[PDB]
């Protein structure tokens, strides 16, 4: 089941904010797995359990009593060490069957503007290379990658046109979902 | 710092205002689900995830620990409150606009801190209620947040739209306008 990382227990209005982010970093599939659990007062991270370090370590002075207190309890250290498998490695297996299997094909669209904007819309994952019959480079501006927050991205690529001879301008999109690159003429 | 994928298998949040909280899981910057701490239910933000099971009691229990940790840290830091950030609102359409063919209007309310905000939509002067939906507070690496509101529209020739944001950082509501 979805295993959560657990918080360690400490011993114009005003707000006091506490954040606990159980974070898993995965690189080369599950070959390199790393847990870093952040305890945060307001926007300042106070303590951190890094699976590479193997202990609670204070980031700021405010989190020094906590770092030593949690390091003295042997149960908490054994549990936080195991969280790499129980939480990161466990949950990743579910990701392999669902999020890491997700793929939405980009919908490429060339259209002029107030200069041609190639709109590469509604695609997942975030890997994409959009390029404009020679590779035009100096007169091109891409927006940064746009995260829509509904599990889809978009990216816009504008090209300043000085045309002649009826030469075709083509948008070339490469993406993990695509079994062959998309070309759109203009 | 550098990885092929990054997830938060626990984005536990607890603030004094209210008080309130938010338990969410995030994978690669996107919200997999949230637990409604009142109704006590995992609400999947992705259909394909509906096959899994997250127990609401797990979220409720962490929020209780978080309340404790917060109280002690209020006293230890001699009652230091949060600093209000200036939210950077941005409005855009999900796909290229074609008149008459439905679309979604996205209002990204970036750099939110503390995570307490109001996000509403305006069509031709007055508010819109139908079609509005929004993501939970999505965590940031600098420990601030951001929310995204959505307004399902049928692009019209005359019609204009606005996103009304009300954070404590702003002295008057930010009204970002949408330009076809």
């Amino acid at each position: 089941i979805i295993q959560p990382e657990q918080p360690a227990q400490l011993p114009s209005p005003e707000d006091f904010v506490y954040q606990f982010k159980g974070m898993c970093y995965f690189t080369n599939g599950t070959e390199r797995v790393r847990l870093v659990s952040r305890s945060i007062y307001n926007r300042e991270e106070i303590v951190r359990f890094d699976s590479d370090v193997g202990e609670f370590r204070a980031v700021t002075l405010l989190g020094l009593p906590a770092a030593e207190y949690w390091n003295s309890q042997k149960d908490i250290l054994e549990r936080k060490r195991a969280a790499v498998d129980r939480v990161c490695r466990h949950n990743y297996q579910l990701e392999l069957r669902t999020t890491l299997q997700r793929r939405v094909e980009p919908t490429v669209t060339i259209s002029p503007s107030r200069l041609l904007v190639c709109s590469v819309t509604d695609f997942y994952p975030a890997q994409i290379k959009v390029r404009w019959d020679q590779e035009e480079t100096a007169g091109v501006v891409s927006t940064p990658l746009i995260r829509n927050g509904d599990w889809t991205f978009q990216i816009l690529v504008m090209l300043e046109m000085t045309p002649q001879r009826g030469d075709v301008y083509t948008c070339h999109v490469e993406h993990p979902s695509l079994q062959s690159p998309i070309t759109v003429e203009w | 710092i550098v990885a092929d994928h990054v997830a938060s298998y626990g984005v536990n949040l607890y603030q004094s205002y209210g008080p309130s909280g938010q338990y969410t899981h995030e994978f690669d910057g996107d919200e997999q689900f949230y637990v409604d701490l009142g109704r006590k239910e995992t609400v999947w933000s992705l259909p394909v995830l509906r096959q899994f099971r997250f127990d609401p009691q797990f979220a409720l229990t962490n929020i209780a620990v978080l309340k404790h940790n917060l109280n002690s840290l209020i006293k230890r830091s001699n009652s230091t409150a949060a600093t209000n950030e200036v939210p950077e609102v941005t409005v855009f359409s999900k796909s290229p606009v074609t008149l008459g063919q439905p679309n979604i209007l996205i209002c990204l309310v970036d750099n939110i801190f503390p995570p307490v905000v109001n996000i509403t939509w305006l069509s031709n002067g007055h508010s819109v209620t139908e079609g509005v939906s929004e993501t939970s507070f999505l965590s940031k690496s600098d420990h601030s947040f951001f929310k995204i509101s959505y307004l399902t529209l049928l692009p019209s020739a005359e019609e204009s739209y606005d996103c009304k944001v009300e954070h404590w950082g702003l002295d008057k509501p930010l009204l970002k306008h949408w330009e076809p």
Partner: antibody
Amino acid sequence: QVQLVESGGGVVQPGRSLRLSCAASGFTFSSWYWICWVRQAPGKGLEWVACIDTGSGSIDYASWVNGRFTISRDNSKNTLYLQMNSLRAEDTAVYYCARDIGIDYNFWGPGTLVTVSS
Amino acid sequence: DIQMTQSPSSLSASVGDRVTITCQATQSISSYLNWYQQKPGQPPKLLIYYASTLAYGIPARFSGSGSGTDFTLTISSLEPEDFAVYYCHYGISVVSFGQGTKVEIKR
């Protein structure tokens, strides 16, 4: 200090009803806690009755309850209630009142004895 | 409700002895099982939460093990103040408890 005090126990005839209270001192419901009514038979195990989210008002009842018992709260009075209706002699037990069960540094009540006899 | 049963219904043990009580759940409750103790006339005292044998100070002889459905309370070297009813618990708002284990003196 922080404590919870039960009240309302006694002899109640089968078929009749009883309302218990649970006064809270040392804390305010206002800061939202999940307070519960856990009953324990005479010489038997601990059994759950119901829980209430003092913030939103969210109630949860045990499977055996079936509309017979009704938990409620008054944040202004910082008191918890449990209206026990349609009582059978099988319901005779001690009723505990507990804040955030399972979380550390969290209190329980002494108990209140409800006896259901004719 | 999640039903969970305890392995020794009751047990007879001596001071110095090692005691092992188990709690099996109907479903996976992750690492969220808690161990409560109850001496006559008093409400339960929490021994362990998650599997962290913590309090403002609970005796280090108590230890919690297990994750998923099967859990184990282990008292390494029994002391005389440990003859009590032991319970396993789950849930902050939808609460389940075990069919307690009595820890009785052997003679």
